[PDB]
Amino acid sequence: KPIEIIGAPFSKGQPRGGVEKGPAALRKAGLVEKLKETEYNVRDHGDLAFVDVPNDSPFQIVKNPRSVGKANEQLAAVVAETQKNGTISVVLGGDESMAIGSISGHARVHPDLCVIWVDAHTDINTPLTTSSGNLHGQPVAFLLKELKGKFPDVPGFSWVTPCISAKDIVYIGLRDVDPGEHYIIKTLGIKYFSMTEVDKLGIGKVMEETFSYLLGRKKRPIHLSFDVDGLDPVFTPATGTPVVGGLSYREGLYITEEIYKTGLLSGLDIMEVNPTLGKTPEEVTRTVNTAVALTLSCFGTKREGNHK
Amino acid sequence: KPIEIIGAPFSKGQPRGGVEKGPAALRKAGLVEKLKETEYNVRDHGDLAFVDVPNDSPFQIVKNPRSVGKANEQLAAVVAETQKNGTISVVLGGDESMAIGSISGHARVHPDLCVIWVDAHTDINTPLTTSSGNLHGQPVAFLLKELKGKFPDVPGFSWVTPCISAKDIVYIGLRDVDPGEHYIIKTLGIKYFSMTEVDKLGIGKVMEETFSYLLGRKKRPIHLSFDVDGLDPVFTPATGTPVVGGLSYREGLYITEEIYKTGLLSGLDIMEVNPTLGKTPEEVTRTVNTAVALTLSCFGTKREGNHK
Amino acid sequence: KPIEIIGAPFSKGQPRGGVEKGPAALRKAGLVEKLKETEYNVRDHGDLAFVDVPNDSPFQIVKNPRSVGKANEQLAAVVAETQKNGTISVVLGGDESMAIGSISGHARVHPDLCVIWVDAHTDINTPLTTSSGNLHGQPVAFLLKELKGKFPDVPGFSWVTPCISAKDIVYIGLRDVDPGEHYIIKTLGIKYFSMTEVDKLGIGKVMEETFSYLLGRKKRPIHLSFDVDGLDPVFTPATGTPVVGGLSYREGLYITEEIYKTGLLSGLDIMEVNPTLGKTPEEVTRTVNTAVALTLSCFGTKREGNHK
Numbered sequence: 069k070p071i072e073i074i075g076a077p078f079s080k081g082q083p084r085g086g087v088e089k090g091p092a093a094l095r096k097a098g099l100v101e102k103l104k105e106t107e108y109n110v111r112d113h114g115d116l117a118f119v120d121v122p123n124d125s126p127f128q129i130v131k132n133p134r135s136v137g138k139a140n141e142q143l144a145a146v147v148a149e150t151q152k153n154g155t156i157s158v159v160l161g162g163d164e165s166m167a168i169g170s171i172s173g174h175a176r177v178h179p180d181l182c183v184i185w186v187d188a189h190t191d192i193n194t195p196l197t198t199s200s201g202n203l204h205g206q207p208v209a210f211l212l213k214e215l216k217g218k219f220p221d222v223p224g225f226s227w228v229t230p231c232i233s234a235k236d237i238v239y240i241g242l243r244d245v246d247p248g249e250h251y252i253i254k255t256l257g258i259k260y261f262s263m264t265e266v267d268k269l270g271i272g273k274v275m276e277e278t279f280s281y282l283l284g285r286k287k288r289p290i291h292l293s294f295d296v297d298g299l300d301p302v303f304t305p306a307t308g309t310p311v312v313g314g315l316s317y318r319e320g321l322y323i324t325e326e327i328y329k330t331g332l333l334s335g336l337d338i339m340e341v342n343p344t345l346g347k348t349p350e351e352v353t354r355t356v357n358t359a360v361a362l363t364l365s366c367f368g369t370k371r372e373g374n375h376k
Numbered sequence: 377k378p379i380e381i382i383g384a385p386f387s388k389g390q391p392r393g394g395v396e397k398g399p400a401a402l403r404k405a406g407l408v409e410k411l412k413e414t415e416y417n418v419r420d421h422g423d424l425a426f427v428d429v430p431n432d433s434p435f436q437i438v439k440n441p442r443s444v445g446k447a448n449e450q451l452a453a454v455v456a457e458t459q460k461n462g463t464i465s466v467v468l469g470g471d472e473s474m475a476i477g478s479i480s481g482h483a484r485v486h487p488d489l490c491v492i493w494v495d496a497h498t499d500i501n502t503p504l505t506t507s508s509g510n511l512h513g514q515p516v517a518f519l520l521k522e523l524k525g526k527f528p529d530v531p532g533f534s535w536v537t538p539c540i541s542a543k544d545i546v547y548i549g550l551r552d553v554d555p556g557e558h559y560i561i562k563t564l565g566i567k568y569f570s571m572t573e574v575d576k577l578g579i580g581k582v583m584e585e586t587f588s589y590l591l592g593r594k595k596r597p598i599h600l601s602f603d604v605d606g607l608d609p610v611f612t613p614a615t616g617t618p619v620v621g622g623l624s625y626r627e628g629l630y631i632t633e634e635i636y637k638t639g640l641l642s643g644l645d646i647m648e649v650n651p652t653l654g655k656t657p658e659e660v661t662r663t664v665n666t667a668v669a670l671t672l673s674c675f676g677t678k679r680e681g682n683h684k
Numbered sequence: 685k686p687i688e689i690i691g692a693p694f695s696k697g698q699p700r701g702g703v704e705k706g707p708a709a710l711r712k713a714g715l716v717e718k719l720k721e722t723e724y725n726v727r728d729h730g731d732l733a734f735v736d737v738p739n740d741s742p743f744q745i746v747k748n749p750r751s752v753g754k755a756n757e758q759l760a761a762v763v764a765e766t767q768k769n770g771t772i773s774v775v776l777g778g779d780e781s782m783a784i785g786s787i788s789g790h791a792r793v794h795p796d797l798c799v800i801w802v803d804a805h806t807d808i809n810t811p812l813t814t815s816s817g818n819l820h821g822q823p824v825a826f827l828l829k830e831l832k833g834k835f836p837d838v839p840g841f842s843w844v845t846p847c848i849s850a851k852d853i854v855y856i857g858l859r860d861v862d863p864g865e866h867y868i869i870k871t872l873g874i875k876y877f878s879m880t881e882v883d884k885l886g887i888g889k890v891m892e893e894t895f896s897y898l899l900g901r902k903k904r905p906i907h908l909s910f911d912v913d914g915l916d917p918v919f920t921p922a923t924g925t926p927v928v929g930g931l932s933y934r935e936g937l938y939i940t941e942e943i944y945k946t947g948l949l950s951g952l953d954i955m956e957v958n959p960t961l962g963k964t965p966e967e968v969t970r971t972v973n974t975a976v977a978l979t980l981s982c983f984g985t986k987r988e989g990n991h992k
């Protein structure tokens with residue numbers, strides 16, 4: 069089974085530019101080379117070419133609706149192609165508005181996949197609940213079958229069709245949820261392990277419960293959307309929306325090591341790394357190196373060691 | 377059920393002045409406003425006016441015995457009044473020598489309450505065991521029925537009458553206990569979860585065991601005395617007596633979230649925040665903001681999110 | 685039962701000099717004085733005098749083979765002498781190539797001892813697997829009976845005879861293991877709790893499982909080789925080979941407090957403290973003070989407190 073890296077240098081999902089430099093920063097740190105040192109065969113698709121859309125006026129509150137919807141439509145078609153060729157897809161973010169396209173194309177080939185969303189935010193605001201118009205905080209809303217038609221059709225996402233139900237997703241790391249988002253998850257009954265559950269159960273018991281909840285009935289493809297700001301700002305400083313009291317370096321590597329070991333990883337996202345957002349160059353290097361550490365962990369690198 | 381904030385800008389319980397600025401710093405950070413954003417109705421009593429006592433010579437080793445005893449006598453009368461009016465009292469410290477008065481007035485109305493003392497210190501030195509004469513480290517000794525008459529009567533605290541027994545208190549966070557204090561807790565058999573027990577059990581299992589130990593026989597009012605230095609100096613830098621290897625931001629918020637959820641919080645203390653003690657202005661802001669985070673957590677703010 | 689401190693100011697086990705200053709730094713911090721404040725009677729043997737060996741050419745890849753082998757031969761004879769006099773030996777490192785001599789002399793008197801190796805590295809490379817020729821990363825290989833004759837005889841260590849089997853050692857803290865080392869531990873089946881197992885089980889459950897695994901059949905002398913770099917570089921900065929995502933201050937003190945409580949500690953090593961390796965003087969003081977904290981914890985100092 070081979071790995072396919074896909075660059076998604078996108079920033080229209082939010083206001084801060086620079087996140088579109090995440091793919092390259094990740095590559096600068098030597099992500100591809102280190103990945104070839106693993107058991108997987110690695111192919112690099114390069115970065116997608118996103119067509120800026122000139123007259124992209126806000127749909128009500130939603131900003132850059134057409135740019136975001138057009139960029140995700142491309143990503144889906146690409147991801148669906150590599151999943152269609154039996155390869156694990158690895159999308160390097162820009163912002164997480166690209167998760168819409170990553171999960172969508174992936175779910176076209178493996179419509180039975182589950183989603184593990186490591187993040188400090190649920191990103192489940194709908195065009196009507198979002199306090200800001202940033203689409204990097206509404207991905208999940210465009211994908212959930214239950215939310216289908218709960219908000220007006222947004223220009224650019226007509227190609228979208230909810231692919232997952234509230235039962236196929238599990239959140240890990242939550243510590244910054246909005247009233248609407250919180251109402252949504254409690255009503256739809258989405259499974260989540262916010263920081264308070266990681267503090268109560270411990271990350272080991274969390275992964276165990278995540279797996280039996282998602283893979284208990286049948287083993288199926290896993291799709292991990294890791295948002296760099298899921299870990300504490302002491303580890304991943306260079307992120308647009310940092311929240312204190314998050315996951316530790318260890319707990320992060322633990323989640324990816326457990327997902328690796330399940331042998332079910334099918335799709336992977338490394339989002340929200342903004343190479344221009346730390347306080348110092350070291351904060352950036354720190355954020356990037358840990359992002360690479362997590363991607364490598366998802367593909368075999370164990371802390372106990374490794375040998376051929 | 378309403379909340380009543382009570383400012384206790386006191387510093388005679390120790391040598392460093394500045395802690396009496398804790399109430400205002402807390403208010404500066406917007407504590408009252410953020411509290412009104414919760415389900416509770418909030419009232420602010422303001423800061424008590426403490427009468428300095430001119431000829432306050434040390435009673436043996438005990439310093440400022442009359443100032444401390446007079447200030448706590450006032451606080452009790454106030455707290456007893458608001459508890460008497462069915463309102464949860466929130467005392468903002470100065471130093472924790474004010475816990476004597478907070479718990480005392482509270483126990484007048486709800487004589488059945490239990491005490492959860494989050495701190496790196498037991499603060500159970502008696503006027504005869506204390507190596508220094510600082511009364512912020514002897515509060516518990518003036519309140520424990522078992523210690524009644526175990527030390528000479530200290531000027532200013534005649535109005536005091538032990539209100540709680542060794543069985544009604546639980547410590548969390550200990551990592552700096554004196555020989556006398558340690559002898560006291562092991563003989564009286566006071567329940568405690570020092571740092572080594574948090575490391576062994578995990579904070580989730582700690583709160584569980586704290587609750588079944590205190591509320592196992594009958595649900596009763598809870599009195600939480602949170603000493604800002606219960607958390608590691610990486611989180612609450614601006615404190616008079618910092619000790620390394622303490623509670624994390626997460627474990628602290630976890631304790632308050634669990635106490636909130638019990639629905640039994642009746643009295644709350646936020647002590648030892650000294651706005652003039654960090655190394656930088658950020659260390660102060662850090663200490664204060666986390667203090668506010670804990671007070672808000674005690675009143676409903678969950679990390680998983682909230683909605684009306 | 686008395687304590688015997690033994691200075692092992694050695695640096696030939698690696699390239700960076702300065703680690704030979706570890707004993708003195710440790711003494712500067714007041715290790716001996718603080719140790720006399722405990723229940724144990726303390727004696728200080730001083731620092732061993734290591735004879736530099738002029739024509740110490742590399743045995744194949746192994747560097748300073750004769751210096752290292754001669755220095756460890758002396759240490760064994762010393763340790764065997766104090767163990768022979770019924771005293772717990774405390775060796776202050778230089779580098780951990782001295783563990784060979786510490787464990788060897790110790791095993792001469794208590795051939796039934798088990799070994800708890802707290803470290804980020806397994807240090808089990810053999811002269812043939814080691815990528816560098818540094819002997820501070822091959823100690824375990826010279827001691828394991830199973831590895832006897834698995835590599836050519838190294839000049840200077842003829843006096844050595846494997847004293848422990850794969851079943852008598854337990855690792856704690858691993859997060860940087862080499863392919864050879866990993867093959868060795870998985871084939872010989874050595875018991876280990878790498879960082880991923882500490883994250884999954886928690887340090888409390890780790891010590892429990894360490895003790896029942898080593899002391900389950902019969903209580904026997906324990907030999908703890910603590911490598912300062914077993915704790916995260918945020919705690920022990922001044923170390924030659926720091927690895928991110930390690931043990932916390934608390935987890936470290938927890939391991940030593942549990943080993944103390946077993947009452948079986950017979951040999952202790954405090955290795956890899958290099959007084960000339962931090963980024964600032966505070967990083968050094970931090971490393972040293974925590975090293976002393978761990979040694980004191982191994983001898984009775986509890987975080988819950990202590991009294992006579």
Ligand SMILES: N[C@@H](CSCC[B-](O)(O)O)C(=O)O
Pocket residue numbers: 164187188189190191193198199200202204205244245246295297309340
């Ligand atoms: N609560 C925010 C969502 S921020 C989402 C950031 B990220 O995509 O990185 O998780 C809102 O209303 O847009």
Ligand SMILES: N[C@@H](CSCC[B-](O)(O)O)C(=O)O
Pocket residue numbers: 472495496497498499501506507508510512513552553554603605617648
């Ligand atoms: N062990 C100290 C007690 S320090 C108490 C500080 B605080 O009140 O903040 O816990 C003594 O002998 O006064």
Ligand SMILES: N[C@@H](CSCC[B-](O)(O)O)C(=O)O
Pocket residue numbers: 780803804805806807809814815816818820821860861862911913925956
């Ligand atoms: N993996 C390294 C071992 S570094 C050992 C350092 B220390 O002794 O401090 O654990 C090598 O091939 O020498």
Ligand SMILES: [Cl-]
Pocket residue numbers: 104108109110
């Ligand atoms: Cl390849």
Ligand SMILES: [Cl-]
Pocket residue numbers: 221
């Ligand atoms: Cl429609």
Ligand SMILES: [Cl-]
Pocket residue numbers: 412416417418
């Ligand atoms: Cl109100």
Ligand SMILES: [Cl-]
Pocket residue numbers: 529
């Ligand atoms: Cl009397």
Ligand SMILES: [Cl-]
Pocket residue numbers: 720724725726
């Ligand atoms: Cl002595």
Ligand SMILES: [Cl-]
Pocket residue numbers: 837
């Ligand atoms: Cl031979």
Ligand SMILES: [Mn+2]
Pocket residue numbers: 164187189191204295
């Ligand atoms: Mn996100």
Ligand SMILES: [Mn+2]
Pocket residue numbers: 187188189295297298309
């Ligand atoms: Mn996020």
Ligand SMILES: [Mn+2]
Pocket residue numbers: 472495497499512603
């Ligand atoms: Mn206190």
Ligand SMILES: [Mn+2]
Pocket residue numbers: 495496497603605606617
């Ligand atoms: Mn304290």
Ligand SMILES: [Mn+2]
Pocket residue numbers: 780803805807820911
């Ligand atoms: Mn070592």
Ligand SMILES: [Mn+2]
Pocket residue numbers: 803804805911913914925
């Ligand atoms: Mn090491």
